[PDB]
């Protein structure tokens, strides 16, 4: 029931256009919503 989000923003410019390397992630937000969700989408902006 706890919904926890981990984030990492700073990139590593080891190579071009492929995510080589690795780095740890630290939690930001924890929400005791308690209800499962099976499907999700994403919001974008067009022109």
């Amino acid at each position: 029931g706890y919904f926890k989000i981990y984030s990492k923003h700073t990139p590593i410019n080891l190579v071009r256009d492929l995510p080589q390397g690795f780095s740890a992630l630290e939690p930001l937000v924890d929400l005791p919503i308690g209800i499962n969700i099976t499907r999700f989408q994403t919001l974008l902006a067009l022109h």
Partner: protein, 49 residues
């Protein structure tokens, strides 16, 4: 309601608030503030951090 200035006790309107507490139905979110105390240094003292 029929009320008058100083009409008695049973006719004077009273503010009434009912509080219902929900427990064990979800993760606990509302709590009471527990009293803390000062710390000590270089003494054999049990702790409850």
């Amino acid at each position: 309601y029929g009320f008058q200035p100083t009409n008695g006790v049973g006719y004077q309107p009273y503010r009434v608030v009912v509080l219902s507490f929900e427990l064990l139905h979800a993760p606990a979110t509302v709590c009471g503030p527990k009293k803390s105390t000062n710390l000590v240094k270089n003494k054999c003292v049990n702790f409850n951090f």
